[PDB]
Enzyme design. Structure first.
Site: not given
Ligand SMILES: *[C@@H]1O[C@H](CO)[C@@H](O[C@@H]2O[C@H](CO)[C@@H](O)[C@H](O)[C@H]2NC(C)=O)[C@H](O)[C@H]1NC(C)=O
Ligand SMILES: *[C@@H]1O[C@H](CO)[C@@H](O[C@@H]2O[C@H](CO)[C@@H](O)[C@H](O)[C@H]2NC(C)=O)[C@H](O)[C@H]1NC(C)=O
Ligand SMILES: *[C@@H]1O[C@H](CO)[C@@H](O[C@@H]2O[C@H](CO)[C@@H](O)[C@H](O)[C@H]2NC(C)=O)[C@H](O)[C@H]1NC(C)=O
Ligand SMILES: *[C@@H]1O[C@H](CO)[C@@H](O)[C@H](O)[C@H]1NC(C)=O
Ligand SMILES: *[C@@H]1O[C@H](CO)[C@@H](O)[C@H](O)[C@H]1NC(C)=O
Lengths: 186, 698
Positions: B357, B487
């Site tokens: 991140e 997805h």
């Protein structure tokens, strides 16, 4: 006894960059200041060994810009602030002082503005406070619901979480003639 | 006055207002995401609403400036990001129908429950309970039950919604002057530089199925090794030369094979790397983890954090009562504000996720000087590729030993390297054929090459052919197995993970070559390398303000996608698996299935054949099974759902097998079904008005 150079650094509010004002008008308060300055760029005269060439008139233009816009208050600079908001001459002498005021100028619900759009560049020491709408072709559109017409005065939009670069900076510019002396102040 | 003298003024007006509105929308979204409540979910519909309205209004006004008669690249590319609308060219009824369809698929995926066949009062959601069974359970029957309960109680609900979704999305994308929704997903990887030498949408498919052919031997050897180690457990259930069953791959869809690592561990006596105990024993916390990540990023030359990162962004679980969804993510709020929202712990995987991140943040910090439309990754792969490649160097046991977590007496033999490389290949190599096959299926469905009556047939055919994975039970056209994944039911592009892996390993090879690394690629640390930081930072800053091919050329010295860095990363594992798969079979045949040996071939010799005759045949087979088991003093209620049909050629022949009710794993033996058919041969075709020569029952 008295040397008027305060009351412009401890003022409760500054205007926007497009609405800068001057003062008609002690230099040891620049080093030992109430607020430690972030920019101390001085052009022409030097900060050290300053009170030797006396000046008969000192102007103090004060406003508020963005954190990344402090670079544009200098002689021979190109930018939105230089072209449309505040211009300095190419042979400018004096010091440019700035300091961060994210805790003060960004806490309130007020707004700070800057002229993004103008018909041509601005002269040094020229003030432009018009609210007339800017048309890309020319003239006055007088209608925001059109094509090519935009609001000139855009908002900084100050928030205390923007971080350095988009934070409010209070800029005070000291300018001297260096050649005008009617023997008033020395 | 003229064009290129007014389009830059239009973009000057756009950016200086889009920055403010995007910052307000991001502030509202952050305030919701860290403080989920009733009054905070209401504020995206008051801020994101104005942002979307402003975006569509400025997109409508951007069409007045043509892409012709403008020469400078940044404003022309900003108008390319605009003009292509945020307002679809679609009817109001059709747009409302599409929004309702997408909400319906999201609700069905999020709130789909699967109940046990016996005692149906307990049911499992996908994330609570079914993912636990798919990850941890080594039982064949429980895994098959969780695999078939999903896609039948959920995927069957998602099939007609997906059909109408495909139709509406093709209609929407054809209004954007594309041809397909898959082509509209390929509006990324679309560059133009000079003389028509740019990267086209059709070049992406050629690049990915060239890369897929280039990763075929390594994946085949990994698949063979996994199949060999999946025979110590599950005996008499996996063919030594066949494909792998779909429900024995570590999760629900076989996406990641990383949960098969305890079953397929090499040298299980050697312990793997786990610095969590030394992390706890040294008094580490979240602040220490993120300060060490910032120290790693400073050491290559990338800057510090903005000091609003340390204040505004939360880095722990909130002690005061505030509902948060705890998914690691990196926030680029705009106006110079960068934040990370993650509920990290003192764990090695949390350490690597913090590096991931913060790599996303450092990539976001670099292009802050670009205009707002160009403040993104150059394509949808570079952003996550930078995120993963920043965590590759710190997972090596030389960066860990420098920080003091790893003891200096730890043995770095050549077996721990094989363990690490096999865990990586289960994470990385085992998900590339799945990603390529799923995106190829979606592209062919959107293009129209797969008809609506051949969705599941083609899906499982190319799942067997490419991935090497066979279904455990047959699925007809009533099913929808792609839509069972997140997805696909939530309308997300999926080739970005494929390109993420390719670009991540390409960047790793380039930065390790620059940092003067000597040994193998998997043991490389780019820490304390200013030269690697300079070449890294000259790519993060470009953002999208440059074609992805020429900003890839500036870092890896190749415009095209290359998988040679990936094959060199797993080269010791590849040459180990070549030695391990020496007495075994490398490859698979697409003819074997778990129901293949117990299925009966039926040929039709003509009265006609609709879908109303298949139901009659299945009812006759179920009645024959009931009659045959009634004389065996075993009363079992066989039904139409207990008869499965595979290899359905609607003109000549098909295969079928019968399964015991309440137990999908309990396939009835082929001799029992043949005896049932022979016992009830009269009234299994008396309804069809045909003799035993027409239905030969081979
Ligand atoms: C978390 O959200 C709640 C509301 O969802 C916030 O509570 C509000 O606080 C403001 C502060 O002046 C009040 O004006 C509102 O009346 C409060 N609303 C409610 C429903 O209590 C709370 O402050 C938020 N906490 C943080 C840390 O952001
Ligand atoms: C990066 O280099 C720095 C300095 O060269 C390293 O910091 C010192 O490393 C030595 C050797 O491990 C330690 O004994 C010191 O305690 C470290 N700190 C100091 C001098 O303040 C740093 O370890 C290197 N990092 C990596 C990942 O190689
Ligand atoms: C459902 O069927 C499965 C498989 O037919 C049963 O599981 C075991 O399967 C092996 C061979 O696959 C047999 O040798 C065992 O006798 C089966 N039973 C047990 C208890 O091991 C399973 O038992 C059946 N029933 C349920 C409720 O799952
Ligand atoms: C980063 O921060 C540390 C401590 O906060 C400081 O010592 C270091 O000089 C900083 N580096 C840069 C490049 O700002
Ligand atoms: C490790 O090295 C030893 C000696 O060099 C060799 O015998 C062994 O096969 C190697 N193992 C692996 C997994 O490479």
């Amino acid at each position: 006894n008295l040397c008027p150079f305060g009351q412009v650094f401890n003022a409760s509010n500054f205007p926007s960059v497009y609405a800068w004002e001057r003062l008609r008008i002690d230099y040891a308060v620049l080093y030992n200041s109430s607020s430690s300055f972030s920019t101390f760029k001085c052009y022409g005269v030097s900060p050290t060994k300053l009170n030797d060439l006396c000046f008969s008139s000192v102007y103090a233009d004060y406003f508020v810009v963005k954190g990344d816009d402090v670079r544009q208050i200098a002689p021979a600079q190109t930018g939105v602030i230089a072209d449309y908001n505040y211009k300095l001459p190419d042979d400018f002498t004096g010091c440019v002082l700035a300091w961060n005021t994210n805790s003060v100028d960004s806490k309130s619900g007020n707004n700070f503005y800057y002229r993004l759009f103008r018909h041509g560049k601005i002269k040094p020491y020229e003030r432009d406070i018009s609210n007339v709408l800017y048309n890309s072709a020319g003239g006055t559109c007088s209608s925001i619901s059109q094509l090519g017409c935009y609001e000139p005065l855009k908002s900084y939009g100050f928030t205390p979480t923007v971080g350095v670069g988009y934070q409010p900076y209070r800029v005070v510019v000291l300018s001297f003639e260096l050649l005008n002396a009617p023997a008033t102040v020395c | 006055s003229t064009t290129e003298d007014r389009a830059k003024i239009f973009l000057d007006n756009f950016n200086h207002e889009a920055e403010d509105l995007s910052y307000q929308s991001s502030l509202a979204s952050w305030e919701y995401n860290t403080n989920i409540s009733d009054e905070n979910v209401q504020k995206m519909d008051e801020a994101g609403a104005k942002w979307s309205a402003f975006y569509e209004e400025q997109s409508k006004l951007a069409k007045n400036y043509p892409l012709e008669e403008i020469q400078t690249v940044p404003v022309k590319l900003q108008l390319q990001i605009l003009q292509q609308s945020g307002s679809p060219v679609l009817s109001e009824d059709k747009s409302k129908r599409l929004n309702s369809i997408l909400n319906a698929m999201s609700t069905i995926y999020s709130t789909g429950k699967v109940c046990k066949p016996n005692n149906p009062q307990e049911c499992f959601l996908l994330e609570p309970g079914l993912d636990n069974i798919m990850g941890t359970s080594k039982d064949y029957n429980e895994r098959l039950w969780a695999w078939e309960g999903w896609r039948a109680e959920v995927g069957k609900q998602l099939r007609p919604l997906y059909e109408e979704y495909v139709v509406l999305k093709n209609e929407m994308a054809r209004g954007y002057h594309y041809e397909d929704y898959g082509d509209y997903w390929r509006r990324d990887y679309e560059t133009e530089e000079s003389s028509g030498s740019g990267y086209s949408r059709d070049q992406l498919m050629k690049d990915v199925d060239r890369i897929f052919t280039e990763i075929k031997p390594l994946y085949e050897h990994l698949h063979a090794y996994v199949r060999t180690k999946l025979m110590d457990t599950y005996p008499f259930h996996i063919s030594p030369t066949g494909c792998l069953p779909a429900h024995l791959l570590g999760d629900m869809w076989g996406r990641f094979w990383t949960n098969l690592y305890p079953l397929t561990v090499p040298f299980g006596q050697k312990p793997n790397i786990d610095v969590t105990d030394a992390m706890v024993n040294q008094g580490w916390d979240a602040n220490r983890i993120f300060k060490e990540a910032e120290k790693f990023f400073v050491s290559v030359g990338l800057p510090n954090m903005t000091e609003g990162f340390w204040n505004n962004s939360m880095l722990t679980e909130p002690g005061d009562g505030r509902k948060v969804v705890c998914h690691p993510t990196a926030w680029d709020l705009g106006k110079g504000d960068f934040r990370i929202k993650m509920c990290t712990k003192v764990t090695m995987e949390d350490f690597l996720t913090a590096h991931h991140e913060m790599g996303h943040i450092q990539y976001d910090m670099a292009y802050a000087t670009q205009p707002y439309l160009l403040r993104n990754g150059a394509n949808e792969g570079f952003h996550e590729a930078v995120g993963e490649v920043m965590s590759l160097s710190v997972a090596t046991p030389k960066h860990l030993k420098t920080m003091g977590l790893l003891s200096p007496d730890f043995l770095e033999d050549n077996e721990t390297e094989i363990n690490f490389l096999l865990k990586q290949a289960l994470n990385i190599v085992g998900t590339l054929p799945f990603t390529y096959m799923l995106e190829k299926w979606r592209w062919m469905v959107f293009r129209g090459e797969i008809p609506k009556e051949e969705w599941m047939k083609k899906w499982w055919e190319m799942k067997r052919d490419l991935v090497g994975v066979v279904e455990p039970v047959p699925h007809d056209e009533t099913y929808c197995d792609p839509a069972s994944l997140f997805h696909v039911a939530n309308d997300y592009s999926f080739i970005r993970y494929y390109t993420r892996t390719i670009f991540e390993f390409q960047f790793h090879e380039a930065l390790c070559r620059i940092a003067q690394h000597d040994g193998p690629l998997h043991k490389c640390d780019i820490s304390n390398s200013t030269d690697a930081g300079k070449k890294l930072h000259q790519m993060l800053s470009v953002g999208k303000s440059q074609p992805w091919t020429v900003t890839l050329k500036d870092i890896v010295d190749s415009r095209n996608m290359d998988v040679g860095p990936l094959l060199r990363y797993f080269e010791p594992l590849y040459t180990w698996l070549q030695e391990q798969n020496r007495k075994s079979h490398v490859g698979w045949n697409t003819d074997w299935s778990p129901y293949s040996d117990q299925s009966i071939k039926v040929r039709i010799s003509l009265y006609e054949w609709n879908d109303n005759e298949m139901y009659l045949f299945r009812s006759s087979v179920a009645y024959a099974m009931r009659e045959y088991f009634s004389k065996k003093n075993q009363p079992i209620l066989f039904g139409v759902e207990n008869v499965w049909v595979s290899n359905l050629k609607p003109r000549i022949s098909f295969n079928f097998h019968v399964t015991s009710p309440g137990n999908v794993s309990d396939i009835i033996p082929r001799s029992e079904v043949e005896g049932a058919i022979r016992m009830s041969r009269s009234r299994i075709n008396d309804a069809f008005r045909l003799d035993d020569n027409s239905l030969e029952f081979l």
